[PDB]
Design an enzyme around this catalytic site. Structure first.
Site, PDB file in Angstrom:
ATOM      1  CB  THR A 159       9.146  11.200  12.082  1.00  0.00           C
ATOM      2  OG1 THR A 159       9.026  12.500  12.648  1.00  0.00           O
ATOM      3  CG2 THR A 159      10.439  11.125  11.365  1.00  0.00           C
ATOM      4  CG  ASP A 261      10.587  16.727  14.873  1.00  0.00           C
ATOM      5  OD1 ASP A 261       9.390  16.748  14.571  1.00  0.00           O
ATOM      6  OD2 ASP A 261      11.071  16.024  15.787  1.00  0.00           O
ATOM      7  CG  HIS A 265       8.791  17.777  19.202  1.00  0.00           C
ATOM      8  ND1 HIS A 265       7.466  17.394  19.273  1.00  0.00           N
ATOM      9  CD2 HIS A 265       9.327  17.110  18.148  1.00  0.00           C
ATOM     10  CE1 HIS A 265       7.208  16.541  18.293  1.00  0.00           C
ATOM     11  NE2 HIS A 265       8.327  16.330  17.620  1.00  0.00           N
ATOM     12  CG  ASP A 308       9.249  14.630   8.567  1.00  0.00           C
ATOM     13  OD1 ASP A 308       9.197  15.837   8.772  1.00  0.00           O
ATOM     14  OD2 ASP A 308       9.741  13.822   9.381  1.00  0.00           O
ATOM     15  CG  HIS A 309       5.918  15.847  10.302  1.00  0.00           C
ATOM     16  ND1 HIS A 309       6.454  16.747  11.199  1.00  0.00           N
ATOM     17  CD2 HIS A 309       6.552  14.667  10.528  1.00  0.00           C
ATOM     18  CE1 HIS A 309       7.387  16.143  11.935  1.00  0.00           C
ATOM     19  NE2 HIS A 309       7.448  14.880  11.544  1.00  0.00           N
ATOM     20  CG  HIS A 420       4.787  16.392  14.242  1.00  0.00           C
ATOM     21  ND1 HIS A 420       4.815  15.063  13.850  1.00  0.00           N
ATOM     22  CD2 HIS A 420       5.898  16.593  15.001  1.00  0.00           C
ATOM     23  CE1 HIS A 420       5.928  14.502  14.305  1.00  0.00           C
ATOM     24  NE2 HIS A 420       6.604  15.407  14.997  1.00  0.00           N
ATOM     25  CG  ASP A 687     -10.295  -2.678  -0.313  1.00  0.00           C
ATOM     26  OD1 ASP A 687     -11.231  -1.934  -0.680  1.00  0.00           O
ATOM     27  OD2 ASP A 687     -10.083  -3.768  -0.899  1.00  0.00           O
ATOM     28  CG  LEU A 689      -8.853  -0.859  -3.589  1.00  0.00           C
ATOM     29  CD1 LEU A 689      -8.077  -2.149  -3.746  1.00  0.00           C
ATOM     30  CD2 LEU A 689      -8.321   0.228  -4.522  1.00  0.00           C
TER      31      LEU A 689
HETATM   32  C1  LIG Z   1      -2.066   1.686  -2.855  1.00  0.00           C
HETATM   33  O1  LIG Z   1      -1.105   1.022  -3.720  1.00  0.00           O
HETATM   34  C2  LIG Z   1      -0.910  -0.343  -3.308  1.00  0.00           C
HETATM   35  C3  LIG Z   1       0.181  -0.991  -4.208  1.00  0.00           C
HETATM   36  O2  LIG Z   1      -0.324  -1.113  -5.525  1.00  0.00           O
HETATM   37  C4  LIG Z   1      -2.271  -1.069  -3.365  1.00  0.00           C
HETATM   38  O3  LIG Z   1      -2.054  -2.271  -2.613  1.00  0.00           O
HETATM   39  C5  LIG Z   1      -2.103  -3.511  -3.306  1.00  0.00           C
HETATM   40  O4  LIG Z   1      -3.491  -3.864  -3.391  1.00  0.00           O
HETATM   41  C6  LIG Z   1      -3.880  -5.142  -3.906  1.00  0.00           C
HETATM   42  C7  LIG Z   1      -5.372  -5.476  -3.523  1.00  0.00           C
HETATM   43  O5  LIG Z   1      -5.691  -5.137  -2.136  1.00  0.00           O
HETATM   44  C8  LIG Z   1      -2.981  -6.233  -3.288  1.00  0.00           C
HETATM   45  O6  LIG Z   1      -3.129  -7.369  -4.117  1.00  0.00           O
HETATM   46  C9  LIG Z   1      -3.158  -8.574  -3.307  1.00  0.00           C
HETATM   47  O7  LIG Z   1      -1.851  -9.141  -3.252  1.00  0.00           O
HETATM   48  C10 LIG Z   1      -1.747 -10.386  -2.567  1.00  0.00           C
HETATM   49  C11 LIG Z   1      -0.265 -10.779  -2.505  1.00  0.00           C
HETATM   50  O8  LIG Z   1       0.240  -9.868  -1.545  1.00  0.00           O
HETATM   51  C12 LIG Z   1       1.636 -10.005  -1.153  1.00  0.00           C
HETATM   52  O9  LIG Z   1       2.561  -9.717  -2.205  1.00  0.00           O
HETATM   53  C13 LIG Z   1       2.672  -8.342  -2.616  1.00  0.00           C
HETATM   54  C14 LIG Z   1       3.615  -8.212  -3.828  1.00  0.00           C
HETATM   55  O10 LIG Z   1       4.981  -8.282  -3.439  1.00  0.00           O
HETATM   56  C15 LIG Z   1       3.101  -7.483  -1.409  1.00  0.00           C
HETATM   57  O11 LIG Z   1       3.247  -6.118  -1.741  1.00  0.00           O
HETATM   58  C16 LIG Z   1       2.091  -7.624  -0.260  1.00  0.00           C
HETATM   59  O12 LIG Z   1       2.497  -6.773   0.819  1.00  0.00           O
HETATM   60  C17 LIG Z   1       1.419  -6.567   1.788  1.00  0.00           C
HETATM   61  O13 LIG Z   1       1.362  -7.523   2.852  1.00  0.00           O
HETATM   62  C18 LIG Z   1       2.443  -7.540   3.793  1.00  0.00           C
HETATM   63  C19 LIG Z   1       1.983  -8.391   4.965  1.00  0.00           C
HETATM   64  O14 LIG Z   1       2.308  -9.718   4.640  1.00  0.00           O
HETATM   65  C20 LIG Z   1       2.901  -6.157   4.304  1.00  0.00           C
HETATM   66  O15 LIG Z   1       4.242  -6.159   4.790  1.00  0.00           O
HETATM   67  C21 LIG Z   1       2.774  -5.042   3.260  1.00  0.00           C
HETATM   68  O16 LIG Z   1       2.850  -3.826   3.998  1.00  0.00           O
HETATM   69  C22 LIG Z   1       1.463  -5.168   2.436  1.00  0.00           C
HETATM   70  O17 LIG Z   1       0.343  -5.038   3.316  1.00  0.00           O
HETATM   71  C23 LIG Z   1      -0.801  -4.313   2.772  1.00  0.00           C
HETATM   72  O18 LIG Z   1      -1.554  -5.030   1.780  1.00  0.00           O
HETATM   73  C24 LIG Z   1      -2.258  -6.196   2.274  1.00  0.00           C
HETATM   74  C25 LIG Z   1      -2.971  -6.928   1.125  1.00  0.00           C
HETATM   75  O19 LIG Z   1      -2.040  -7.633   0.299  1.00  0.00           O
HETATM   76  C26 LIG Z   1      -3.221  -5.811   3.420  1.00  0.00           C
HETATM   77  O20 LIG Z   1      -3.833  -6.949   3.989  1.00  0.00           O
HETATM   78  C27 LIG Z   1      -2.485  -5.034   4.511  1.00  0.00           C
HETATM   79  O21 LIG Z   1      -3.397  -4.522   5.446  1.00  0.00           O
HETATM   80  C28 LIG Z   1      -1.708  -3.855   3.932  1.00  0.00           C
HETATM   81  O22 LIG Z   1      -2.647  -2.879   3.507  1.00  0.00           O
HETATM   82  C29 LIG Z   1       1.903  -9.125   0.105  1.00  0.00           C
HETATM   83  O23 LIG Z   1       3.015  -9.590   0.864  1.00  0.00           O
HETATM   84  C30 LIG Z   1      -2.686 -11.449  -3.163  1.00  0.00           C
HETATM   85  O24 LIG Z   1      -2.672 -12.586  -2.340  1.00  0.00           O
HETATM   86  C31 LIG Z   1      -4.141 -10.951  -3.271  1.00  0.00           C
HETATM   87  O25 LIG Z   1      -4.900 -11.893  -4.032  1.00  0.00           O
HETATM   88  C32 LIG Z   1      -6.212 -12.257  -3.500  1.00  0.00           C
HETATM   89  O26 LIG Z   1      -7.280 -11.488  -4.061  1.00  0.00           O
HETATM   90  C33 LIG Z   1      -7.387 -11.690  -5.478  1.00  0.00           C
HETATM   91  C34 LIG Z   1      -8.180 -10.612  -6.228  1.00  0.00           C
HETATM   92  O27 LIG Z   1      -7.679 -10.539  -7.552  1.00  0.00           O
HETATM   93  C35 LIG Z   1      -7.871 -13.115  -5.777  1.00  0.00           C
HETATM   94  O28 LIG Z   1      -8.048 -13.304  -7.168  1.00  0.00           O
HETATM   95  C36 LIG Z   1      -6.823 -14.089  -5.221  1.00  0.00           C
HETATM   96  O29 LIG Z   1      -7.286 -15.417  -5.339  1.00  0.00           O
HETATM   97  C37 LIG Z   1      -6.486 -13.763  -3.750  1.00  0.00           C
HETATM   98  O30 LIG Z   1      -7.565 -14.229  -2.959  1.00  0.00           O
HETATM   99  C38 LIG Z   1      -7.114 -15.270  -2.068  1.00  0.00           C
HETATM  100  O31 LIG Z   1      -6.690 -14.733  -0.819  1.00  0.00           O
HETATM  101  C39 LIG Z   1      -7.724 -14.132  -0.041  1.00  0.00           C
HETATM  102  C40 LIG Z   1      -7.119 -13.499   1.218  1.00  0.00           C
HETATM  103  O32 LIG Z   1      -6.421 -14.461   1.991  1.00  0.00           O
HETATM  104  C41 LIG Z   1      -8.834 -15.163   0.253  1.00  0.00           C
HETATM  105  O33 LIG Z   1      -9.907 -14.562   0.936  1.00  0.00           O
HETATM  106  C42 LIG Z   1      -9.374 -15.812  -1.039  1.00  0.00           C
HETATM  107  O34 LIG Z   1     -10.397 -16.771  -0.742  1.00  0.00           O
HETATM  108  C43 LIG Z   1      -8.207 -16.349  -1.904  1.00  0.00           C
HETATM  109  O35 LIG Z   1      -7.610 -17.521  -1.370  1.00  0.00           O
HETATM  110  C44 LIG Z   1      -4.192  -9.542  -3.906  1.00  0.00           C
HETATM  111  O36 LIG Z   1      -3.949  -9.592  -5.297  1.00  0.00           O
HETATM  112  C45 LIG Z   1      -1.483  -5.858  -3.149  1.00  0.00           C
HETATM  113  O37 LIG Z   1      -0.747  -6.788  -2.372  1.00  0.00           O
HETATM  114  C46 LIG Z   1      -1.343  -4.524  -2.432  1.00  0.00           C
HETATM  115  N1  LIG Z   1       0.065  -4.130  -2.261  1.00  0.00           N
HETATM  116  C47 LIG Z   1       0.561  -3.451  -1.218  1.00  0.00           C
HETATM  117  C48 LIG Z   1       2.059  -3.093  -1.251  1.00  0.00           C
HETATM  118  O38 LIG Z   1      -0.071  -3.059  -0.235  1.00  0.00           O
HETATM  119  C49 LIG Z   1      -3.388  -0.294  -2.695  1.00  0.00           C
HETATM  120  O39 LIG Z   1      -4.654  -0.929  -3.031  1.00  0.00           O
HETATM  121  C50 LIG Z   1      -3.446   1.140  -3.192  1.00  0.00           C
HETATM  122  N2  LIG Z   1      -4.453   1.829  -2.433  1.00  0.00           N
HETATM  123  C51 LIG Z   1      -5.449   2.513  -3.034  1.00  0.00           C
HETATM  124  C52 LIG Z   1      -6.467   3.131  -2.109  1.00  0.00           C
HETATM  125  O40 LIG Z   1      -5.550   2.588  -4.274  1.00  0.00           O
HETATM  126 CA    CA Z   2       9.380  14.018  11.597  1.00  0.00          CA
HETATM  127 CA    CA Z   3     -13.568  -2.376  -1.033  1.00  0.00          CA
HETATM  128 ZN    ZN Z   4       8.552  15.357  15.854  1.00  0.00          ZN
END
Ligand SMILES: *[C@@H]1O[C@H](CO)[C@@H](O[C@@H]2O[C@H](CO)[C@@H](O[C@@H]3O[C@H](CO[C@H]4O[C@H](CO)[C@@H](O)[C@H](O[C@H]5O[C@H](CO)[C@@H](O)[C@H](O)[C@@H]5O[C@H]5O[C@H](CO)[C@@H](O)[C@H](O)[C@@H]5O)[C@@H]4O)[C@@H](O)[C@H](O[C@H]4O[C@H](CO)[C@@H](O)[C@H](O)[C@@H]4O[C@H]4O[C@H](CO)[C@@H](O)[C@H](O)[C@@H]4O)[C@@H]3O)[C@H](O)[C@H]2NC(C)=O)[C@H](O)[C@H]1NC(C)=O
Ligand code: CA
Ligand code: CA
Ligand code: ZN
Ligand code: XFT
Ligand code: NA
Ligand code: NA
Length: 805
Positions: A159, A261, A265, A308-309, A420, A687, A689
């Protein structure tokens, strides 16, 4: 602490939540145990029930009543929803004939058609047909509006992951709600359905639609609802909000139902007890639509009816227990049920080992009803790995089953008959979508689509710019009458080189051999033309793929196939070829078994080498364009070029060789020709990507040849299979896969048998959308077709599911 001695007088269902310790009067106050002392009395009135009756018509207003039937109620916005029917001789909305809503017919002061999302928990897709006789309001929405036969939820089909995906357009790995239960090792905290940790904002990532709206100056009604607020009061609350002055009134509203739902169940998806909950949901839809009609909003609001499902038959006796497989069962924590997630019970226990747990759970019993995976090996279509809240070991549970740790967990927790959570391609997990209103189409059926797409459409319906998400904006434009989003194709970032013959054979020292010294003006000009692209129109049907990142690559033409060859990864990024229905399959001739030929268009420095494969005792190689499908003995030599070679484990070659020798021709036979584009994928950080060069964890021993984590193929033909793939006038048909490049076939429990008994089953499991391959490769396909771009976006999001009707 809450100072609950404040009052809800004039505050009932206020939209802005007030902060501690002040008492609350919003629709979630009950959840926080924070409502003011007089919330039930003032805000949860129930007196005289929910319906007007003849005796109540024109009554003197009694502010005690749940709803009103006095003359003033319409201007107060608080009539019972059947007021006009009972008291003013009007019809129920469901009894009115459908009439196309060509334009919004809205009251003065309305800036945009409001959006009402009516979410139903556990509403399986087949309820729309199977329950249609008992759901007349829902049937009218469905038949008169825009509907899909089903909508695909995200995995896991639970859910909270799905409702939050609906709200954000994101996969659960990205929004962070990866289950109904979770442990986050960074926070060292646990999230549960029961209790309060789930109220902490740190769990909830991305940007849900109510925040998107608010940031862009569109007001939103509150989307969560405390369970104890009856549905009739939720509906009357939405109708009261719709009667607010223009500057105060939200433009987006959500209703949520815990049914069907809750009953499913208990009783199973089709238990005889399920009829009554479906009747009751339909009555709620009826109250909303009658209420809208009273407000002259029934041809102004866009309504989404969405689940939702679905729900599957699952009982206690169909449970696998890990205690029947593991000696060490007390050393693990399992998140159980319709999926399994395993981690160490103690991070101090140094003897815990995931490899030994996986092996102990792999193919141990003849009809074993779950399969273990390291999360990076799960089908890529699940997008279920890139989050620290997803445990490394995952169990994919067969439909109709549960997994649990020990038997005592199940009888000291038969009660339930439905559940589910399974793989989101399973037919019982599919759910519903209907859109009804001025912005949706009239009496229109659309193909099934994924719920990650709806956030963008909800943004389009509200004139909002979506936050970045996993939908493909434009792929649902065919649902809409107006407000379509007109995307432009992404710009190509790297342009190809087109090398000619630049190197002599003796410049190569790759340790390769080929018996090709086998010796004409007619046929020499001919071979030169093929190398310059004279057959490219036959084998590249939809334009070359665009490369959306900076790199160095070459286009290589041949009689039977074209490729984009990466000088950085030393192999093609893509190889494209068309196989007609009449194509013939041949063998690799004896003299060519170990043939690999230098490509005189590509430098020795940018080539693979055979000696690396001889030295790497674990790694062999395959070819992207298959030699079995060469158009002639002479063309076949092209297939052995070093620029067509890719690294392949011998276990994987079993899979690949069967796909190329048997299945490609079977598809061309069935589909009237196919165009195939195949290539490697590198996703070492799971990831979803494309990896950059510096993220590659494995190379062919001793070399700079990177090892793919997966191999893809996109197989396209004409939707009208009376036309051959290469002469198609209209819409296309596609199926694709992303196969994991594994050094064993442990995933396939029958792999000791002939490939005809297991390979296609593997491939179906790893079915994919072209969009999934785009993310994983940085390529953009179908750039040159006759079709509209939105239609191509729909095609790129298609998933071939291999489920029966
Ligand atoms: C599905 O769609 C989504 C949305 O478009 C895609 O996800 C995006 O992917 C991008 C690449 O993975 C990612 O970009 C990064 O953003 C970093 C900043 O992130 C914060 O700010 C954003 C914007 O508000 C925010 O949304 C983020 O939210 C995430 O994290 C919090 C936890 O704090 C969670 O609450 C939230 O759920 C979300 O988590 C998810 O994403 C993170 C990754 O950000 C995962 O780790 C989690 O598991 C989870 O999946 C953040 O709060 C930014 O810092 C990154 O920049 C690094 O990389 C670039 C490359 O250009 C580099 O140039 C920079 O220098 C930097 O590197 C530095 O940091 C590294 C790591 O510490 C280090 O190793 C280096 O040496 C450097 O110092 C990066 O740009 C974007 O945030 C997410 N957005 C979301 C919402 O998830 C997703 O890819 C799509 N999926 C598919 C399959 O297509
Ligand atoms: Ca449900
Ligand atoms: Ca990859
Ligand atoms: Zn249920
Ligand atoms: O409604 C319920 C049950 N229920 C009941 N009482 C709740 C009280 C508070 C909270 N809190 C509010 C603060 N949070 C929050 O606002 N998070 C977002 C805003 C900032 C970033 C993300 C985090 C969550 C959640 C609930 C809740 O689920 N179930 C139906 C439903 C409807 C829509 C969605 Cl999307 C989902 Cl997932 C579930
Ligand atoms: Na080898
Ligand atoms: Na096997």
């Amino acid at each position: 602490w809450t100072a609950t001695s404040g009052s809800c007088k004039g505050r009932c269902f206020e939209l802005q939540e007030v902060g501690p310790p002040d008492c609350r009067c919003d629709n979630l106050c009950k959840s926080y145990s924070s409502c003011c002392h007089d919330f039930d009395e003032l805000c949860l009135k129930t007196a005289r029930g929910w319906e007007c009756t003849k005796d109540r018509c024109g009554e003197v207003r009694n502010e005690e009543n749940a709803c009103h039937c006095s003359e003033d109620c319409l201007s107060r916005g608080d009539c019972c929803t059947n007021y006009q029917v009972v008291c003013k001789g009007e019809s129920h909305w469901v009894d009115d004939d459908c009439e196309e809503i060509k334009v919004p017919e809205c009251p003065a002061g309305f800036v945009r058609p409001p959006l009402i999302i009516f979410s139903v928990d556990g509403f399986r897709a087949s309820y729309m047909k199977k329950g249609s006789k008992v759901m007349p309001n829902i049937e009218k929405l469905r038949s008169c509006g825009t509907h899909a036969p089903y909508m695909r939820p995200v995995y896991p089909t639970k859910t909270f992951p799905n409702l939050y995906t609906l709200a954000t357009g994101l996969y659960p790995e990205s929004h962070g709600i990866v289950g109904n239960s979770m442990y986050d090792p960074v926070f060292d905290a646990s999230f549960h359905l029961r209790g309060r940790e789930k109220f902490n904002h740190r769990w909830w990532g991305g940007q849900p639609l109510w925040i998107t709206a608010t940031k862009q100056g569109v007001r939103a009604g509150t989307f969560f609802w405390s369970v104890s607020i009856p549905h009739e009061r939720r509906i009357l609350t939405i109708l009261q909000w719709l009667s607010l002055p223009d500057n105060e009134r939200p433009s987006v509203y959500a209703f949520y139902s815990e049914q069907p739902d809750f009953s499913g169940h208990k009783y199973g998806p089709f238990g005889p007890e399920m009829t009554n909950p479906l009747r009751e949901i339909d009555k709620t839809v009826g109250q909303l639509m009658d209420g809208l009609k009273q407000l002259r909003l029934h041809r102004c609001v866009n309504v989404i009816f969405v689940g939702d499902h679905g729900m599957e038959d699952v009982t206690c006796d169909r449970t696998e227990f890990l205690s029947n497989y593991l000696t060490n069962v007390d050393d693990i924590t399992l998140v159980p049920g319709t999926l399994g997630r395993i981690r160490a019970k103690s991070i101090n226990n140094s003897k815990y080992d995931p490899k030994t747990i996986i092996a102990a759970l792999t193919c141990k019993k003849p009809d074993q009803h779950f399969k273990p995976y390291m999360k990076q090996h799960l089908p890529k279509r699940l997008h279920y790995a890139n989050n620290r809240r997803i445990e490394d070991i995952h169990l994919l549970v067969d439909r109709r089953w549960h997994v649990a740790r020990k038997p005592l967990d199940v009888y000291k927790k038969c009660f339930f008959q439905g559940d589910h959570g399974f793989d989101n391609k399973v037919n019982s997990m599919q759910t519903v979508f209907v859109g009804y209103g001025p912005t949706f189409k009239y009496r229109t059926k659309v193909p099934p689509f994924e719920n990650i797409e709806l956030y963008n459409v909800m943004c389009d319906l509200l004139g909002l710019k979506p936050a970045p998400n996993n939908g493909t904006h434009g792929s649902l434009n065919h649902l809409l009458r107006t407000n379509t989003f007109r995307p432009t194709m992404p710009d190509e970032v790297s342009r190809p080189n087109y090398p000619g013959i630049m190197y002599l054979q003796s410049e190569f020292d790759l340790g390769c051999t080929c018996d090709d010294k086998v010796e004409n003006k007619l046929e020499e000009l001919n071979k030169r033309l093929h190398t310059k692209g004279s057959t490219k129109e036959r084998h590249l049907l939809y334009g070359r793929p665009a490369v959306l990142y900076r790199t160095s690559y070459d286009i290589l033409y041949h009689t039977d196939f074209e490729s984009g060859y990466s000088e950085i990864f030393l192999m093609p990024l893509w190889t494209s070829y068309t196989i007609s229905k009449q194509a013939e399959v041949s063998s690799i001739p004896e003299h060519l078994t170990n043939c690999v030929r230098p490509d005189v268009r590509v430098s020795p420095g940018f080539s693979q080498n055979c000696l690396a494969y001889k030295n790497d005792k674990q790694m062999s190689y395959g070819f992207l364009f298959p030699p079995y499908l060469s158009s002639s003995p002479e063309a076949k030599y092209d297939a052995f070029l070093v620029t067509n070679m890719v690294p392949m484990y011998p276990a994987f070659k079993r899979v690949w060789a069967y796909f190329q020798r048997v299945l490609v021709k079977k598809y061309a036979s069935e589909r009237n020709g196919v165009n195939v584009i195949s290539g490697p994928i590198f996703d070492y950080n799971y990831d979803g990507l494309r990896d950059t060069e510096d993220e590659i964890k494995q190379y062919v021993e001793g070399s700079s040849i990177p090892v793919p984590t997966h191999y893809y193929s996109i197989i396209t033909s004409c939707l009208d299979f009376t036309q051959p793939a290469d002469k198609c006038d209209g819409p296309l048909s596609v199926s694709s896969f992303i196969l994991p490049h594994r050094p064993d076939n442990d995933e396939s429990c029958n792999s000791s048998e002939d490939e005809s008994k297991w390979v296609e089953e593997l491939m179906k499991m790893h079915t994919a959308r072209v969009r999934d391959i785009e993310h994983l490769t940085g390529l953009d396909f179908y750039r040159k077709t006759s079709r509209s771009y939105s239609e191509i976006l729909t095609l790129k999001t298609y998933l071939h599911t291999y489920e029966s009707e």
